[model samples]
Target: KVFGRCELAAAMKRHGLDNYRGYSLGNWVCAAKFESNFNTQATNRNTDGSTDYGILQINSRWWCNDGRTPGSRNLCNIPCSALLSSDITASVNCAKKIVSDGNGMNAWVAWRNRCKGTDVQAWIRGCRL
Candidate 1:
């Protein structure tokens, strides 16, 4: 996991994630903070037998395949384990695709619950970028 929010922002910028799909970098950062605290290895099992993976907490039901989960749409055509990498390339790509699919950051419950309508600037408050 990255040690600082600036580092995470730099990584996200390097991946060309700033302002992706009309969403601000702060929106992305806030979602990341709430979803997995920028820890790419994060994983959580949902009540419906689906699992959330990586920094974005992408669901196995539609975004990625965990192999054990049946009926996974695997729209990203990637393994769930790939999202666990610190590199974050695959994760960012998948998230872009997800937002493009029409839900924006609304696909992430954390964004709706914690980030929406909040002062998202705090997410990048210390970053030089």
Candidate 2:
């Protein structure tokens, strides 16, 4: 599902993404905007032979197993297929695990480059959560 701003805000909030650790809801919103554009089916191939899957582009190398990437740790212990689904709960759970680690939001290059230094509130403006 392609979520609009308000729905995305509410959905992430329901998952406790708002101020999750030190990252704000708007920070996650900005991550999704750049990573998947709020589209759950989004996928991309990386040059390292790993694939990024679903809304947050969780990687096959360290997070989910795709039965394709070599040496996948499957730290999230989730199948890559689930990350592409519209339900989003699986990926959100995986995302939390990602953030819960030492790297925090820096796990996503999209988030690091595009969201890290931005005034992310603009990503949440006019949205009702």
Candidate 3:
């Protein structure tokens, strides 16, 4: 029931991303490291059992707002029991959108400078937990 590379690949396919490039996975992993250390069982401070959890560290509250709130709905807040969930690629894209919008690899470059980061290779690399 956990999300692995195959599951993540399927999720990406659903999102119209047939290929999760090394660059993308690298930054996605970076976001995961920054937020939840790639631990799906982890949880951040918030209600509904999520504030920032899972590998991509999605915020349930921020993602599942009832539309009356003043924030974007991430849709990754759904519980874990919902098998074949979107947290894998959903959260991965969520992180990519953030990083891409910010400074591309430069932000990660700086983060790697601070922490143990990896070089740009064909595989996703960098800090992990």
Candidate 4:
């Protein structure tokens, strides 16, 4: 639903995410790509009966409620659907909180296995941001 990775990078930068909480913008970009391919509406059901929401794939286990659930940790205090929006403001803010809370990108399995130590420049290349 976004223009692509370039747009996502620009949005991230505009939201003061060039280098957030010691994590590089490239790392965020790579994590976003691997998690949801930049689709705002993307959702994946996990084996544990929880779903990952939105572009950054915040999980229902702790970040947000799935609407059908009653006892979510719900750290972001926003509905799971909030993350599935092109606005991305809530998603970005929640992601910042997630990282700052000591999870970092380690919360995203894709980031740990695919982005860590990888050259992630391509995620922001030609974005001019």
Provide the lDDT at 55 for model 1.
Answer: 92
- Those runs of model 2 whose alpha carbons end farther than 4 Å from true positions after fitting are none
Give the TM-score ranking, best first.
2, 1, 4, 3
Give one digit per residue, the lDDT tens place, for model 3 in 36-115. Answer: 44455554545444454455444444444323334546454544333124346545455445444545444333234533
TM-score of each: 0.95, 0.96, 0.42, 0.93
Q: Return whichever of 1 and 3 wins on TM-score.
A: 1
In model 1, the Cα lDDT at residue 121 comes to 77
| Local error of candidate 1 at residue 1 (angstroms) | 2.5
Error of 4 at 54 (Å): 0.3
lDDT for each of the candidates?
0.89, 0.92, 0.43, 0.86
In model 3, which regions exceed 4 Å deviation? 1-24, 46-50, 60-87, 103-129
Which pairs in model 1 have colliding backbones?
Answer: none
Model 2 deviation from the true structure expressed as Cα RMSD, one decimal place: 0.9
Supply candidate 1's per-residue lDDT for 74: 93
Model 3 error, position 73 (Å): 5.7
For residues 1-129, write the lDDT of model 1, one tens digit per residue: 653788888888888888888778889888999999888899999888899999999999998999867778999999999999888889999999998887778999999999999988788887987
Global Cα RMSD, each model: 1.0, 0.9, 7.1, 1.3
The deviation in Å at residue 63 for candidate 2 is 0.6
How far out, in Å, is residue 106 in model 2? 0.9
